[PDB]
Design an enzyme around this catalytic site. Structure first.
Site, PDB file in Angstrom:
ATOM      1  N   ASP A  17       0.819  -1.235   0.072  1.00 25.30           N
ATOM      2  CA  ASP A  17       0.102   0.082   0.008  1.00 25.30           C
ATOM      3  C   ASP A  17       0.772   1.431  -0.160  1.00 25.30           C
ATOM      4  O   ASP A  17       0.456   2.232  -0.500  1.00 25.30           O
ATOM      5  CB  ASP A  17      -0.885   0.193   1.293  1.00 25.30           C
ATOM      6  CG  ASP A  17      -2.005   1.258   1.344  1.00 25.30           C
ATOM      7  OD1 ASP A  17      -1.724   2.323   1.679  1.00 25.30           O
ATOM      8  OD2 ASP A  17      -3.227   0.972   0.618  1.00 25.30           O
ATOM      9  N   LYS A  20       5.148   2.645  -3.647  1.00 22.99           N
ATOM     10  CA  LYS A  20       6.285   2.409  -4.392  1.00 22.99           C
ATOM     11  C   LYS A  20       6.100   2.192  -5.840  1.00 22.99           C
ATOM     12  O   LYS A  20       6.720   2.851  -6.657  1.00 22.99           O
ATOM     13  CB  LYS A  20       7.041   1.293  -3.759  1.00 22.99           C
ATOM     14  CG  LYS A  20       6.401  -0.011  -3.539  1.00 22.99           C
ATOM     15  CD  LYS A  20       7.397  -1.213  -3.045  1.00 22.99           C
ATOM     16  CE  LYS A  20       6.713  -1.634  -1.675  1.00 22.99           C
ATOM     17  NZ  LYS A  20       5.563  -2.666  -1.969  1.00 22.99           N
ATOM     18  N   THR A  21       4.893   1.737  -6.323  1.00 24.28           N
ATOM     19  CA  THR A  21       4.477   1.584  -7.675  1.00 24.28           C
ATOM     20  C   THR A  21       4.341   3.052  -7.970  1.00 24.28           C
ATOM     21  O   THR A  21       4.873   3.453  -9.034  1.00 24.28           O
ATOM     22  CB  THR A  21       3.624   0.707  -7.732  1.00 24.28           C
ATOM     23  OG1 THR A  21       3.881  -0.617  -7.249  1.00 24.28           O
ATOM     24  CG2 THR A  21       3.153   0.531  -9.033  1.00 24.28           C
ATOM     25  N   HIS A  61       5.695  -9.362  -2.464  1.00 23.21           N
ATOM     26  CA  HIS A  61       6.610  -9.783  -1.327  1.00 23.21           C
ATOM     27  C   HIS A  61       7.459 -11.014  -1.597  1.00 23.21           C
ATOM     28  O   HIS A  61       8.488 -11.082  -1.510  1.00 23.21           O
ATOM     29  CB  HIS A  61       5.553 -10.157   0.003  1.00 23.21           C
ATOM     30  CG  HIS A  61       6.927 -10.330   1.186  1.00 23.21           C
ATOM     31  ND1 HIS A  61       7.952  -9.483   1.326  1.00 23.21           N
ATOM     32  CD2 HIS A  61       6.597 -10.918   2.250  1.00 23.21           C
ATOM     33  CE1 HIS A  61       8.495  -9.746   2.463  1.00 23.21           C
ATOM     34  NE2 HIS A  61       7.761 -10.826   2.950  1.00 23.21           N
TER      35      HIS A  61
HETATM   36  N1  LIG Z   1      -3.118   9.377  -0.628  1.00 23.37           N
HETATM   37  C1  LIG Z   1      -1.851   8.637  -1.171  1.00 23.37           C
HETATM   38  N2  LIG Z   1      -2.283   7.732  -1.745  1.00 23.37           N
HETATM   39  C2  LIG Z   1      -1.294   6.972  -2.223  1.00 23.37           C
HETATM   40  C3  LIG Z   1      -0.108   7.586  -2.460  1.00 23.37           C
HETATM   41  N3  LIG Z   1       0.570   6.782  -3.071  1.00 23.37           N
HETATM   42  C4  LIG Z   1      -0.058   5.700  -3.498  1.00 23.37           C
HETATM   43  N4  LIG Z   1      -1.261   5.608  -3.006  1.00 23.37           N
HETATM   44  C5  LIG Z   1      -2.491   5.069  -3.297  1.00 23.37           C
HETATM   45  O1  LIG Z   1      -2.623   3.889  -2.550  1.00 23.37           O
HETATM   46  C6  LIG Z   1      -2.786   2.770  -3.457  1.00 23.37           C
HETATM   47  C7  LIG Z   1      -1.650   1.702  -3.063  1.00 23.37           C
HETATM   48  O2  LIG Z   1      -0.331   2.469  -3.422  1.00 23.37           O
HETATM   49  P1  LIG Z   1       0.701   1.605  -4.070  1.00 23.37           P
HETATM   50  O3  LIG Z   1       1.615   2.493  -4.692  1.00 23.37           O
HETATM   51  O4  LIG Z   1      -0.114   0.708  -5.163  1.00 23.37           O
HETATM   52  O5  LIG Z   1       1.326   0.638  -3.079  1.00 23.37           O
HETATM   53  P2  LIG Z   1       2.559  -0.498  -3.055  1.00 23.37           P
HETATM   54  O6  LIG Z   1       1.909  -2.116  -2.953  1.00 23.37           O
HETATM   55  O7  LIG Z   1       3.748  -0.398  -2.281  1.00 23.37           O
HETATM   56  O8  LIG Z   1       3.025  -0.561  -4.627  1.00 23.37           O
HETATM   57  C8  LIG Z   1      -2.804   3.163  -4.704  1.00 23.37           C
HETATM   58  O9  LIG Z   1      -3.724   2.625  -5.854  1.00 23.37           O
HETATM   59  C9  LIG Z   1      -2.535   4.541  -4.790  1.00 23.37           C
HETATM   60  O10 LIG Z   1      -3.720   5.071  -5.447  1.00 23.37           O
HETATM   61  C10 LIG Z   1       0.229   8.918  -1.757  1.00 23.37           C
HETATM   62  O11 LIG Z   1       1.356   9.316  -1.902  1.00 23.37           O
HETATM   63  N5  LIG Z   1      -0.682   9.230  -1.527  1.00 23.37           N
HETATM   64 MG   LIG Z   2       3.825  -2.659  -6.775  1.00 29.77          MG
END
Ligand SMILES: Nc1nc2c(ncn2[C@@H]2O[C@H](COP(=O)(O)OP(=O)(O)O)[C@@H](O)[C@H]2O)c(=O)[nH]1
Ligand SMILES: [Mg+2]
Length: 177
Positions: A17, A20-21, A61
């Site tokens: 969440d 990173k992506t 992961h």
């Molecule tokens: N409000 C907010 N939400 C974020 C931010 N970055 C990512 N998210 C949201 O949270 C969801 C998960 O983030 P994601 O980048 O996919 O997490 P990952 O699993 O580490 O790759 C995404 O669909 C984004 O829309 C941020 O800086 N602010």
């Molecule tokens: Mg990802």
């Protein structure tokens, strides 16, 4: 070294969440304006005016663990996203150790959810507990760059938030020998 100009593979470690992506997307975009087994892997290449970067982000992961444990990636530079909304959760702690073993010399920490975190008192607090994991497990943790933005905003538009991605790029060039 001069064509690539120093070629750096920078490794992005999250929990599920953190963004990173997202962090990964943002950096490139920012970069463009200002300058310009089974293995599952996601790849981006990016350039600062000094270094040139290859970046790897793994949908899971399971991916990080296998990918880091074999050879996938080779990761000189490890860029880390700990998200203010939560705190460092398991996947982050795990990622940190695994890194140490892996031989991931440098972990540079980026704090995401400041599109949602008003509270110098918390941030310090997300920010402290990171510092605490980093040391117990591996790393300096003191003399270790911590960068807070919010990746989501940065792509999306204009902003102050964008500017931070710039530190991330900046530290990268500095922090990573
Ligand atoms: N409000 C907010 N939400 C974020 C931010 N970055 C990512 N998210 C949201 O949270 C969801 C998960 O983030 P994601 O980048 O996919 O997490 P990952 O699993 O580490 O790759 C995404 O669909 C984004 O829309 C941020 O800086 N602010
Ligand atoms: Mg990802």
């Amino acid at each position: 070294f001069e064509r690539t100009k120093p070629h750096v593979n920078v490794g992005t470690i999250g929990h599920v969440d953190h963004g990173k992506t997202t962090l990964t997307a943002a950096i490139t975009t920012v970069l463009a304006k200002t300058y310009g087994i089974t293995i599952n892997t996601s790849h981006v290449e990016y350039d600062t005016p000094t270094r040139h970067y290859a970046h790897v982000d793994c949908p899971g992961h399971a991916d990080y663990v296998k990918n880091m444990i074999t050879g996938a990636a080779q990761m000189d530079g490890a860029i880390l996203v700990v998200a203010a909304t939560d705190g460092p959760m398991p996947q982050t702690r795990e990622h940190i150790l695994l890194g140490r073993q892996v031989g991931v010399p440098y972990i540079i920490v980026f704090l995401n959810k400041c599109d949602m975190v008003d509270d110098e008192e918390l941030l310090e607090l997300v920010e402290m507990e990171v510092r605490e994991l980093l040391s117990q497990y591996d790393f300096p943790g003191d003399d270790t760059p911590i960068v807070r933005g919010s990746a989501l905003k940065a792509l999306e538009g204009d902003a102050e938030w964008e500017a931070k991605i710039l530190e991330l790029a900046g530290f990268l060039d500095s922090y990573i020998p």
